[model samples]
Structure formats: C-alpha cells, structure tokens
Target: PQPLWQPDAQRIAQARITRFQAWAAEHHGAPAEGGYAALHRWSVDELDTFWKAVTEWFDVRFSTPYARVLGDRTMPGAQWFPGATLNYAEHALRAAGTRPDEPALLYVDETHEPAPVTWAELRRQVASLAAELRALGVRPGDRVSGYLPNIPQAVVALLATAAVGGVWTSCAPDFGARSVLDRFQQVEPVVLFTVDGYRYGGKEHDRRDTVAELRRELPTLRAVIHIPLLGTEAPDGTLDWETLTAADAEPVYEQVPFDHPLWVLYSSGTTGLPKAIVQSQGGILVEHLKQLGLHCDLGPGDRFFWYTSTGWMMWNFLVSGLLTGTTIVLYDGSPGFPATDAQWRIAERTGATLFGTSAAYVMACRKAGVHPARDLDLSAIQCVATTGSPLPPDGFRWLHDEFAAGGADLWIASVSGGTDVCSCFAGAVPTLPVHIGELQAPGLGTDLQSWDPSGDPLTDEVGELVVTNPMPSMPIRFWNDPDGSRYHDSYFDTYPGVWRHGDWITLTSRGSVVIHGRSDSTLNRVRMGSADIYEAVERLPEIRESLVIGIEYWMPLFVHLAPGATLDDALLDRIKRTIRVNLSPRHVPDEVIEVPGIPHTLTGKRIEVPVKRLLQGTPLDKAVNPGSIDNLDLLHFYEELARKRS
Candidate 1:
C-alpha cells in the first residue's frame, strides 16, 4: 500500500479559498465574501486577470511603458507586456543589503574544504567583475560565456555580464569541449571564463588543455579569464584571477528597460543542433522573484542552496534567489566527496533554509544507506527541492522516513519544466500539502495542460504535456536565426502555436501531475496501443530504477528493459511477467539487459533518442555530443553488451 498523508477536506477547501482571495485581491477586485470553490473558479476562468494581479502584487519593476498587458491569450501569440524594457541583473542585486554576516554561499568539497560567501561579498564580486569586463571593451549586446563549474565565479561572471548589458551563457565543465563548442560557437562570445581544472568523485580533472583547444577553435573569443580552482598558474595569454580586478570599485548598475536580452541558454541537442534560447531581462526577473517570494516562501533572512553547475538551467534559477534578498549558497567539487553527507553537513553548518538537488542524488543517498537526520541536526532546513526527473514514490518515502520524520514542516518540492522557457510548468508552494510523487500544481501564470496527439485536452489520462499560451518567460528568439525559422520549428511546428514540451504526463483528480518519461520514448506496439512503460515499472519498489525502449526488429512490439535492481533468472522472469499481467502481453520485454545507469541529460531526464542511437550500432563520438553524458562508461557497457549478443 502507498504511504498515506492525505489532506483533510476542510483543510483543502480552506486552502483553495485562501488562494482565491489572494488572487482576487491582487487581480480582478477586492476579496469576495464567498467560499473556496468560488475563488478557484475565478482563478481558472479569469487567468489574464489573475496574472495581472500577480504582477502587481509582486511589484515587478518595469522600465518602459508597455502597450499591452497580455497579447493574443492564445498559444504562440500570447505575448506578455509588449513594448516593455527591463534588466534582469538589477533585480538580483536588490538583495545586497539584507544581511552582511548571513551566508550567501556555502561551497564544500570532497577535501572537506568549505567556503562561505555573504550577500555583501557576492555583490562586491559581481561589481568588480563587471568593472573589469567594461575595461576590456565589453559593452551592451556582446556575448559573454562561462565554461566553469557550479562555483561562486560562475554566478559572478553571469551577473557581471548582465550588469554590462552583455548576454550571458554557460556550460558545466563536465561537458566535453566539442559539445561546448557546438553551442558556444553559434553565439560568438567575446569574453570566456573558465577554471584550470575541477575535482569530482575524489579525482582531479584538468581543463587547461581543453580550454586551450576551445580558444583555438573559436577565434571570436577576445579574452579568457582563468579561475584557478585547482590553485594552478594561469596559461599564456590568459589573465590571472586577481589581476583582472584588484581595485575596489562599486558596481555601475546601468538599469535598462524590460525585455532586454539577459541570457542565451541552449536546448538539449538530442534531436539536432541545440537551439540557442534567449531570455529577456524583465520576464526572468519578475518570474523568479515571484516564485521565490510566493511559491518558495523565500524571504530576506533565508539562506538558499542548490547543487548545480553552469551547464544546467537550475544554475540560472538558483542565481535568481539573490533577487529575493536571500543568501544564495554555491558549491564546487563532488557532493559525495570525502563523505556522502557533505551536502547535509553544509546545510546544518550554514543554517540553510532551502536545499535543492536532483532526484538521482536523493536515490543515491538512499542506496548508500546514509541518514543525515540521524547524524546531524536538520532543524534549519524547511524545504528541499528535487528535480531533473520524476521523484520515485520510494524516494519520497525515504525522505520523510529517513530525513524529516519529526514534523519539522519539511516540504519536498518536485518541479518540472524545460530549458525552452527558463521557468517551471509545475512547482512548489508553501501553502499546499506535499504529495508523494506529484508536482503540487501548474505554476501560477503558466497555462499548463495535457493534450492528446489530436490536440484535445485530457484529465485523469496520460498525454503530451503542453502549454496552451505563451508566457513572458518564452525565448525571445533563437540566436543567429534571422527569420525565426529555428525558433518556430523548435516549438510551434509540433501543434502550430501550442508549445509541445514532449513529456508523457498524467493529471490526477487532486490537481497534481505525474511525468512518466519523454514522449519520444513512449512505447508503441504493432497490435496494441501506446503506453508509458517507465511510469508502470517505476511504480514497483523492488526495481530501484529502469528504462524501457521499443526494438523494431522482432515486430514493433519488442520491448527491452535496462533494470537497475539486482537481476537474476528468477527476478528477470518475474519482471517480464509483471509487465505482461499488469499492462499487456505486448508490454513484455524481449530482452532484459542489466546496465550500470540510464543515459540522461544534465537536467536528469532520460535521453531516449541518444540511447536509441547507441543501441543501433553508432560510435559514442558519432552520437550527437558525447560530452552531455554524466557517465560515459555506461555507453561502453552497452557497446560490450551488444558485442556479446552478436
């Protein structure tokens, strides 16, 4: 039986009513004297009014006057606040004076070296970096990219770039130089920030050679600022860290209008070349500030920490916490270095109120049998956010039982969205009850819905996840795509104007959502219909993790299983039988292969398209970009398995 923590009907009703009143007060008019259902009706029925109210309530700063509050209200054309100009970097710097001593960032490494930076110090660093960039001829509209780790330098570089009106882009050090070049070359960055090397899983991986190769490849790069994370000397022609900015100069904040391009993030290059998605200053600032304030309940006194690198979009999201007047915690090195409890120890030591990590990390902690709740005091943490993939029900149980069982009011927030837009379709709010495996609800202003292949909406049934309207956070345009052809083809080509996010999802009666897997990987049999096998198999606790793909050779119905749990003849037989009985005989696996790990993007979602290519006799390098893989050894394991089968 599933763990039970259902909310009371009365409590649910009251909560719904409160949200309604809050919506009404912010948007349409004064609060109505009616009950909970009435407010919900207003919120759903009058979304434009509700969103307008939210913008006003949050007090998002707008520089130039907008001609319209919301555009068409239809998919693709639902332009938000047309003709507005805003700067995203200014909002993040607004929290500079919240507290001088409070920890803004707590970086812990496998060597047990912990570094903490306060908000005041972070602000100064950003100012110094911005000044140094200005001195190097970096002006508005130039591109600045960081090929760095999830350290303080990444944040400083990003903010500094934005401060000077230069668009910022980044990728983590884990990405191979080829993958980085594939994306960065399209933008033609003028300034590049990179470290000599980084340590992960207790090993030192140097990037000096890779950085030198990248500089050779991209002639457009004007300057390379090397951060000595490994305490190494700078390479020839590369400026040392301290030499760039030694004078204490105040950050010259050049406030611009709303809708100024602040960031150029890329889509996962699963299908083709990664599309360069540009985000506006106003949209990012307002959305992130609202999310931090209303949804995450972040305030001036809170400390926020997320384990992320420049490569992933979460790094972008985490940096926005600085705008909420909360101290942002950054870390370099491995989360499992020296000890698996390194992250938890930092949370305890730094008094972090908000903690963010991937679901894979949570499951790894469970598999390792480490319980931080027993070893350390977790009184300071009130919320933990998990994303990248669906949090298995078992992971949820483990968190409550092993991590926060003492009624500490801890919330496990699971958010879902893509890099297409820099925000989530569904996310967390402090007012709601935490469900086991469901995302709380669609984000407030995002008109998220599930649609069948025929473009019809569905509830309580699995279908493609889509956004029915254009949000402010939508990509401004693809970089270098003059006619917007690439931008249009990326999203609008699926269902015309509708944004097809390509996830197989099901909406529950309780208004929560469950993401099965990517829509591209949904299993389709020759005789039977389509079904998401990952959702079905993942529901089983005996199987720690698994991935299902269709092999077209033996009829189109042949299913292959990559099981993560202990596999034997008996267990394999049982697994096939369970799929046949519970789902359909067509769902039974033709081959049950045991692999080390499933291939996934940096964000943690399964990379089915790439994995399928690997299975079909493609070289690892020949595959789109090998650098995107977290574990390249897994591909070798698959190659060996294929050879053995032959």
Candidate 2:
C-alpha cells in the first residue's frame, strides 16, 4: 500500500522534530539530509549528547543541576541524569497556571454531560487534595492507589499524589477484586481513591462491594477517598471527594532525585503476578516532554483525547499532554456506549485535534459497519494513533478510505509499546510519512532493532524486537524485587544485557516497524488481566486442564477433557459464560479446541511458546522438542489442527 498521509513541506518545517534536527546540526554537526530515520540513527549514535540536547531543547527545568547525564550504560543499572533533582508534577503544574482562563481537563463520560475543568480550579483542586493527602500521612516514597475510571478526578489525584511526593498507581473499576489485589497488594498503597460504581454501555456497574473488599484486603489504607460518580455517598469511613478538595491550601512540590520513584505501573500480568514496575520523576518528565512535543507534535490549544482507562498506561500518556500545555479529554465508560458512534461525536464536540485509541476499537468500529466521516464532522482530528495490538491492513485501509472522505487528510500513525515504559518505542513523527500497518520510525534516542534468536540483528525479517541501549523511561526496578533480580530476569534474562521487548517484530527496508503480536504468553491486550483468564478457565469442572497461548494474532485455548468427557456445544457455552461472568467479554477466547492433554514439561510447567509457534504455521519438530515434552505423541494432533487458524 502507498502512504496513508505525508506532511507537506510547510507542515514539516513547523514540526518540533525538524526544529530539533536544526538544533542537533548546530550543536553536534548532525546532517539535515538525514531524514527522520537518519536523525533517529544520530540520536542513538550520540546517546548521551542526544538526551542532553533533548532536555536543553525542551528547556526542562531542574531544582538541582546534574553533574553527569548518564552513570553506567548497563542494562537494569544504567542511571540517567545522576544527582539531578526534579519533580514530574512540577513540570505539569506549570501548565496549569500558564493559561488559567482555558480548561485543562474536558470530562466526557457515558452517563454525564460534557464538562470543562478550568486550569485555575485544577490547580486549586490539586493543592487542596495534596494538603489533604499530607494530612492523612501521605509522604515521599509512599504508595497511593486509585480504583477509579477514566475521569478528570483521577488525573487530579495523580497530580496531587505526585505533588506530595507519593508514588501513584491506579486500576480501572471494571477489574475484579483479585486482579486489583494482585497488583495493589504488591505495592501496599497507603491511601486509596475509588468510586462507589460506574456506568458503561447503558448498564450500571455497582462497585460498592468491591470497595468494601479492597478496604478489607488492604489494611495499609490510612484513608479512602471516594468519588460519587454513580450518585452515591462515600462509604461509611471514607472521605468524600468534594469535601476533600474544599480545603484552602497552597500546592507544594518536593524536589526529588532523578531516580526517585514517580509511579508504580504494572506489567500486563497475563502469566501470573504483576510486576510493580517503578519509574522515576525526572526520567518521565524528560521522556514525556519529548514524546508529547517532538514525537506526537502536541502543543498549546491542541486537545488530546486518548480513549483509555485509568488502568492502562495510555491514560498516563494522555494526561502527560498537560506537560506539553494541551487539554486532555477523558471518557470514563465504553466508547460504543448507548450508541456505536459515541467516540466520534465526542471528538467532534471536543474539537480534539489529536485522537489516540487502540487498534481493537478501530477494528470493532469497522466490524459494526459505521464510518465517522459519513456520520460526524472530523475536520479537526489531525492524527490518530492506534496501539495495544497490531492493526490489520484492512483496518488501516478502511480508516483512511472513510476518514479522508471529508476532504481533510489524516495522519494515521500506529504506535507500539507497553507499560514497561510509560511511552512508545516506535511511534509517530510529524515529518514522517504514514505507512499503512507500520510504525513510521523507531522512537528517537531508542536503539531499536529486530534480532534473531542468536542475538544477531535481522533486517526486513520477522524476529524478536530488542533494544540495544537503555531508554530513560525504562523501569528502574520492580517494587519488591530489591536485588534487581526479577527486573533483569523479566526483560534481560533471554537476551543477556539487551532489552527483549517480547514482540515478534519486523523492520522493513523502508524503516517502518510491523509488530506481529506478543512473541510470548503475555497477551497484548492492555487491561485484559491474564490471571483473570487463567482463574476463569480453571474453575470449569469440564476442563480437567487447560493451556492458553496468545498466538501471533489470536488467542488459542487448548483444553484437556476429563475421562469419558466430550467437547460439545453445551460445554462450550458453559465455558464461555464462565469467562464472561467472571472476567470480561474481551477475555473470551477466539478458539477453544480440545486436545488429548495439555503439553507440559516433565517439571509440570505448561509449554507456552512451543504451542504458540505451532499455531503460527511453524512445523511440529521445530516448534517443540520431542525429547523435552512429556508426551511426543500428543504433539501430532496439534500439528494436524494447526492447518486452521487459531
């Protein structure tokens, strides 16, 4: 396919990426003929010089100057900006008062009307909340967790938490108690923020029971502040959000070190326990300033609306628009709630210039047979970023063919990354051409490549995606893994000193990245907690044993039936119902096929990668080692079933 959209010469000149290119040449003698890809190459080549240039170009402020930009370039140990004292919330707070007349946050939910939260009120609210949090024992390095929706209050709480030097973490209201407990319990949050319930897709989801359970499970909570979105009062002992934000106090920001933990973001937790990945204040500030301005070209008067939940990493990314002086729009409920065209109308009504969403939502909209250009005015939307999964070629084509019908072109940039870094690895740049189903370029300053199993770089071939150098946004450590053993084992154990991103990736000759899918069992869906899937399937009596693998593009569920049991429609219905009720509809399997036995090692661990490979059309012998499996004959049936798609 040809390019979806390309920037004109005038637009290219105005881009921050181009401005940085000029800055690089003047300071470091970088070539201008060097396009976006070459500039990225330059960024990685002069790693230290390039990052320092970035902070300088963005005019990133610091309370204390750093003696060194980087300490060691070692994996899981590389320290960026050693001895620097800065705060993430401080940078974001400056924008709050920059233009107090304009709204900083535009709140739109399924059940509520569109509301504007002005910059002045945002600062006052954050200040009052920060003081309230400090009164309740919230302090530096302490944990404050939120079980909330994608609302303005959640954004306020994060800033308030960060302002008071507390590490912020959050989970969406839809997650089960066990899923929430699996993550929050690991961090042991001192303060909890939640809602009584939320409305989604024309239905009421009462979370009062879940809140009670959280209070019971997390005895570390000194106070619980509840937002009554569902028109209910706060729980008996908790503080009301309105009452807490009423205190008249000035906002305070304590300057913390570059390595000070800013927030504890979790891994997808598909396999088991979620890693409490900790990121830093200075690291996030510098990275997000670059991401929001240079990579995404977001700026003042630009409204950014990324359809994300508080649980997902993109929610954090969307709120970072504040750091770039852009208004952030958040929708709490389903994108397709009440009507299929809810998001479309919200974008038009909000005048959102940059819209971000998951590929899943795009595909779902296509499947529903609705076109935004046909039904709504989308003249203001300039860029649309899709992630979380690979957007199929048809989705890319459908979006362009339909959205461009309004006589306005689109920048359909497909970005790919994960919660491990609250930023993108391969995302958008205003100066680059938008290629269908391909990420335009590797993120500037990130040395990204596709490596063969033996750790050799492979060009234009499907291979494991690896980053040769450490990114500033990379997690400094997991919460409880004090020795740094778990953090190393999580990303570097397979590649030895390199960051293996766990995605089957291919870098084309055109310098575009195509993400196949998760190369391992951790599915790419952001909020589809993997433990929930395993928990739901294991509860079925009909399933004697089961193994779930996220094959290249789909989820394949293999069940081992009991003695004299048969795989029937009735049993399938029961299994599906169990997953729907216990977890979510999105967690339901794409294919549920019967197998004689679940392939396992002699040690009893389920074989995941081999099974994933077999479904992806790899031959039986290559996908699995006959000598390693407990049963060699069991592999034969899977080879036969591999002829069909997962």
Candidate 3:
C-alpha cells in the first residue's frame, strides 16, 4: 500500500511539532531545514538541552524553578530539575479551567446512555474528593489505592490523590482480591477507593464480596470509599462516595520535589508478585505534555478515547490527555460487548478525534469480519492509534479500507511502549509519512535503537530494543526493592548501561521501527519471536486468538478458533504454511494444537514466557500467579498439556 495517508502541507505546517521546530530555529538557533529527522537527532544528542526545551515549550509551571535542567545523565542516577516543585493534579486541572462546559470527560457504559461531565462538574468532584481524602488523613507522600474500573470516578480519585500530594495506585475491579492485594499491599495505602461493582458484556458483575476481601487483606486501609457504581450499598465501616464528597470544596496543590512519587504502577505479575514502578510528578507532567501535544497532535477541542482498564498503563496515558487540554473519554465495558462494533460505536458516539486502541483489537475485528466503518459514522475521527502489541501490515491496511477512510484521510498511527515507561518509545508523528508495519519515528528525546547481542546498533536487522539515553519518565525506583537490586536487575541488567526494553525491534532505512516481540526468548528454528507468528496466524479470519511459546526451543502454537469454526487438518496445514512463507522455514512450530482459549493477563497481553516456564517444569507458584490471569482456568489446560508431554 502506497502511503495510506500523508499530511498535507497546511496540516504539516500547523502541527505542534512543526511549529516547535520553527520556534527552535528563531529562538534556539536550530536548523530550519532539519525537519522531523533533524529535530529528533538534536533531541537525543543534547539530552539536557532538549529536556530544558520541553519545559519551556510546553509552558511547564514550576512553583519553584529548578536548580538545573539535569544533575546527571546516568540511567539510574539521573536527577531531573532537582529544585523544581509542581503538582500533577494542578497541571491536569488547569487544562479544563477555561472550557468548563466543553465536556472535559464523557462517560459511556455498557448498560447506560452516554453522559458528559463538564469541566466545572469534573473540577467540583475532584475538589470535593480531594477534601474528603484530606479529611480521611491522606497527606503528602501517603499512598492511596483504588479497586475501580475505567470510569470517571477513577480519574477523579487519581486527580484528588495527586492534588493532595499522595501517591496513587489502582487496579481494575475485575482483578481478583489477591491480585489487587499483591500490588496494593506493597505500598500500604491509607485510603482504599472502590466501587460496588461494574457492568461488562451486558452483565452486572458485583464486587461487594471482592471489596470485603480487599478490606480484609489490606489492613492498612482506614477508609473504604464506595462509588455505588451498580447502585449497591457500601458495607459497614465504609463511606459512600456521594456522602463523603458532599462538602463544598477546594482542591489544593502541594508543591513537592521533582521526583516525588506521583503514582505506583505495577508490572504484570506472571512469575511472582508484580514490581511496583514509581513515577515522579514533574517527570510525567513534562513527558505527557510532549506526548499528547506534539506526538499525538492533541489539544483543546479534541476528544481522546483509548480502550483500556485501570489496570493498564494506557489508562494512565489516556487520563493524561487532560494535560494537553483534550477531553478524555472513558468507557467501562468490554470493547466487544454487545457486538464487535461496540468500540467503533463509542468512537462515533463520543466524537473522538483521536481513537487509541490495541493492535490485538484491530486484528480481532478483522478476523471477526465486522466493519464498523461501514455502519458507523466516524467522520470525526482524524487519527487511529494501535498499541499493546505489534500491529501487522494487514492491520494497517484495514484502517484505510474500513469506514471509507473516515470520509477523509485518516492517520493510522501504531505505537509500541510498555508499562515500564508509561509512554511510547516509538509512536506517531502527525507530520510524518504512513508506512505498513512501521512506527513513524522514535519518540522525541528517546535514543532508541535496534541492537545486536553485542550492543551494536543494527539497521533493518531484528534485535533488542535499547535506549542509549536516559529519559525523565524512567521509573525512580521499584517499591520494596531495597538496595535498588530489583530495579537495576530489571532493565539495566541485560545491557550494563543501556535501558534494555524487552522487545525485538528493527530500524528501517527510513527513521521507523518494526517490533517483533519480547526478545528474552527465541523460537525453535530461526530464533523468531511469538509476535512474528501471531502476525501470520491471527491474519486468518478463522483464528480468533493465538499464543506461541518455546519450551527449551520446543515450539507449541496454541490457537483458539473463531466462533463456530473448527481447526481441522486443512486449517493446521495452512497455519504452518503461513508461518513458513511469511516469516521463515526455521520459524515453523513443532505442533499446531487446537485449544479452547489462550490465556491472557488482566491487561489483555499473552502470558507467553510464564507459560513456557511452567511447561518447562517450573513450579506453578514460581511460574505464574492465579490472580494475574483473566481466565485462570486457561492455565489448567496448559498444565495438563505440559504434564502430558512430560
């Protein structure tokens, strides 16, 4: 496909990145001709200078100016704006200040009509919530945890916690109590926020019992504030959200250190309890302004919608759109609840200009053969973002062919990042060209590259994704990992100095990236990654979901056939043939197995490595955690397979 969509000259000139480049030329003496490539190279080359530019370019408000732009550039030792003081909640609140009636938040649920929360209403609720949290004894550096869904209340809780300088953490309500405890227990939050329950897939799933278990597991919680999402009553000793936040309120901002813990994000716990990654308030404020403004081309008047749960990092990213003056949309339900077109219908209903979702969702839609573009009026959509996995080339093609290209040119931006950074390493640039299976460019200020085992940068060759430079958004530390051993061992252990993001990637001749999958392990024949096989296997309409794992390089391709379909000999033969032809003969699997389902983490990612380890005889406790799985029974099937093979 020849460039699905390209930005017109007027559009390019008006883009935030382009305007920034022009400003750099006149103000900072940056080359006028360098364009996007020159600007990116300059950002990575002068790390301190580039970061300094970000604060100024985005008008970052500092209660107290920084002692310096950067104290050190070392990966773990890097300290940013040592003397700076700012509040994360303040920055988010400021964006919605001027547009009180413009719908700062739009909420849609599976069972209810869409509702808009105006900027004034959102602020009042946030302020009221903040006052209530303070009344409950939440103070600076205090931890606040939420067992909530991806709803407006979750956003309100987060902002309220930030406003009071309390570190916030949350898990989707669907996560079992043990899973929630395994994460929240580490931080020992003082106030626990939750809901009576939530609705998903046209069914009411009550979590009153789960909340009861939560109260029991986390003894540190002083107040359990219930939102009554399902109109259920809060148990004894728990406070109702409406009653708690009824007072007329003012949300106060507490100035804190540059690296003060803003939120604690947990890693997907497959092998053991999840690692709590702590991000700073100022760091996230600066990075998100750049991401949401320039990279995503979002600002006031734009409605940003990303399908995610509170458990995922995308939820953090989606909520941060507020920092750029964008109205964030929240939907609490399965993406494909009533129908496969549920999410697309959300896009139409919310009038989301930038629709961010997962690559798997795109493939799932194609496999289901449901085109919402044909039925839904998506004329408001300008950019469609796919992340959470590598978007295959065919997935990109579907964006243009579907929905009549939104009745106009639609920018299909596929981004790849992780929970570790809470941002993208390679994402979309509104001013760049579109390419199949290729990320637009390395994120501004990210010294990302495809590197060989020897740590040498490789072009067009699949290798490990390494960040040669430190980022402001890198986690300050992992909670409970005293002596910094676990924190260092996770990212820096693989490559001594470089930040080794655990993904196999390639650098194209153009400044683009092609991601394969997790690079820690390899396939049987030609050292292929699972994503390469998924790109081929999931391409077939008959396949709904697939998981590939290598046990001592013994590959087993487990697949879940589409609804009402059978994976017979013919399908198996074609599956193998697809891999051999699309990737390599060496990439062919040892067995093509028929499985009822593929296990996924609560965040909707395949737990491939842990399953591989379990089959390799790693004990169940050491291999995986039941709380971490969406369908815990999916593992029983794998356990049987592994034991049968043994």
Which candidate leads in lDDT?
3
Cα lDDT listed for each candidate = 0.72, 0.81, 0.84
Q: Look at candidate 1 and tell me the lDDT of residue 605.
A: 54
Q: All candidates' TM-scores?
A: 0.87, 0.82, 0.95
Candidate 1 per-residue C-alpha lDDT over 597-622 given as tens digits, one digit per residue, 9 for 90 to 100: 67666556566667666667676667
Ranking by lDDT: 3, 2, 1
For model 3, residues 406-467, the per-residue Cα lDDT tens digits are: 46767787776578878988878989888767788999999989889898999988889898
List runs of model 1 lying over 4 Å from the truth. 1-48, 72-78, 98-101, 111-113, 403-407, 526-532, 535-545, 551-568, 581-586, 594-598, 602-604, 613-623, 627-646
The C-alpha RMSD in Å for every predicted model, in order, reads 4.0, 9.7, 2.1
Task: Give me the displacement of residue 256 in model 3, in angstroms.
Answer: 1.2
Index of the highest-TM-score prediction: 3
**TM-score rank, highest first?**
3, 1, 2
Tens-digit lDDT track of model 2 for 477-538: 88878688778877898988899887777888887787755566566554232434655686
Q: Cα deviation of 595 in candidate 1 (Å)? A: 5.1
